[PDB]
Symmetry: C5
Subunit: 147 residues, 5 copies
């Protein structure tokens, strides 16, 4: 009965990811919703992962009620960052419309390493927390419309 | 009479009301009915409409059009610009893809001040214009027999 | 027998829109093509409008040979303009590919009122006319390939 | 038996376009491939044209083995150059994946007339020849995977 | 064992060799096999993978995953950010659209020096990471039973 979410986390900063993962798990537990957790090389692999789960569920696998996307992108000195942030947000959003699914977007786009934690921890910004609530919020509507 | 679905994203309850007020007014004045749901951000509006569309395919509410409302001010963080482009993009695509009437009332201003100059139905009434856009599209959608 | 296209115009500035429309109409008349005209609030609603026409044609509705999209986007003070410029273009481009249809893109993106007129007027740059001519060229290619 | 490609050229600057087309045609000649040439007014019209060709093939029309897209965008005064550059590239790439086709991308995006010649001329950068060759390369990979 | 298709876009033969080397090493180390095909630019990579997928359908090689390699060095012109943007965009979509495992090894650096820092396996081993990324995605793809 209680929604079972699939948390897809992209981690390069074990410390940071742990903050978001905790943040997301926090809000989810308080809401009393079960969940699994898979790990991917980067934010860009999050969409495909969700896509894998949907395909699996269509083959009798776990039929998730919603998904939470966690990851951290910091704009360093290389150009391989602005692209990740944009395209990940784009893919996730399209996937959400295309597959008519609930997806909490916790892919944080931070400038420096500092803001990464400000937004990471659940005590401060708790962006991982909002992601879960967003997910559940979306799961709620998804249910409401009986999609 | 057209039954619209108003999907709003709200972070600043206040600003969101000026917009929902505008949208609701415009729809009321045109004699259109509607339901209202809420989402945490502009980016979730596309998916919400998607749900409604799927839901209607399974005996759910058969909406005639949609009204998207939200506010995205460019502050300092980068999690603003991207939200603005994608929301607009996803909404536009959704409308073409599903061939549906969508009133785009997602505001993209530079500051809190410009937000109300667009929100309040006393000013630019962006919410009202969005609702009217929706109605316009619904009318076009019918005229063509889509 | 002669090409019949659907002019979809987004009109905020009534005068500018009349100028573009005059341009589009003059070019279409000159080639011997016919057309219907529908109005929408903004450039962003043109792709869907065309989408409506295509659907309606699949239901015994009007069968257009091509489309002309007319609109005027003036980079004002608000940031809500560069978005309309990009997406309208991208949305139209995709639609033309996705649906293999002839679309003259006459959505102007100008810096101000002055350039709007410089571009909208048939007497000057005639973008409405060029968009119509582009639609006609595309219809020609479309017929040539037998699509 | 030799590859037969369709060259879709966006033609605005006649001389540059001729250089470009000369580069492509020469590259296709040297490899023994044949080609048809169609003209559109802008780069944004190339993807759809290719779309028509594909639709026509299904309708008993000419079956092409690959496509060469030629065009020249020079960042000038209008803001309708950054959009054309990105969206045409995006549209073509998207089209190549979606339809699994061989497309040589010779749409040039240069800062000025001088660089346009440096790139367009077969005797220099020969971007037209590169695109025609890129197209033949993709046709080769296409046959290789038996697609 | 997994059989991958490495699609490399190569202009700078030296950098390409680095990435390829790094990718092959990471795949052999995991016991995965692979075929290598070469394209002119990063933008042809998505379509190449598309050809593979297509060919599989006709009794052609069935790949369990793909590794895309290329290096886009932002020069003095802006026609590098386009290639960089659209290739990353196209691969991400193909991975979602076809639900396949794709290791993104397309490098987007500021200068040549950085390319080598990312290309060399002794360094940031981006080629190896893309290959590893692909394996991970293959594992996950298996886990969910995609
Ligand atoms: Ca002046
Ligand atoms: Ca010089
Ligand atoms: Ca095939
Ligand atoms: Ca090891
Ligand atoms: Ca097979």
């Amino acid at each position: 009965d209680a929604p079972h979410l699939l948390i897809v986390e992209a981690r390069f900063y074990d410390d940071l990811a742990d903050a978001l993962l905790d943040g997301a798990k926090a809000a989810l537990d308080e809401a009393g919703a079960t969940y699994d957790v898979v790990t991917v090389p980067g934010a860009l692999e999050i969409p495909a992962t969700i896509s894998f789960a949907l395909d699996g569920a269509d083959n009798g696998g776990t039929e998730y009620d919603g998904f939470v996307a966690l990851g951290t992108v910091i704009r360093g000195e290389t150009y391989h960052f602005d692209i990740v942030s944009n395209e990940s947000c784009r893919a996730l959003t399209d996937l959400s419309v295309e597959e008519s699914i609930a997806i909490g977007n916790g892919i944080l786009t931070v400038e420096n390493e500092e803001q990464a934690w400000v937004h990471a921890r659940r005590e401060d910004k708790d962006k991982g927390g909002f992601a879960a609530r967003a997910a559940l919020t979306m799961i709620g509507l998804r249910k409401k419309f009986g999609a």
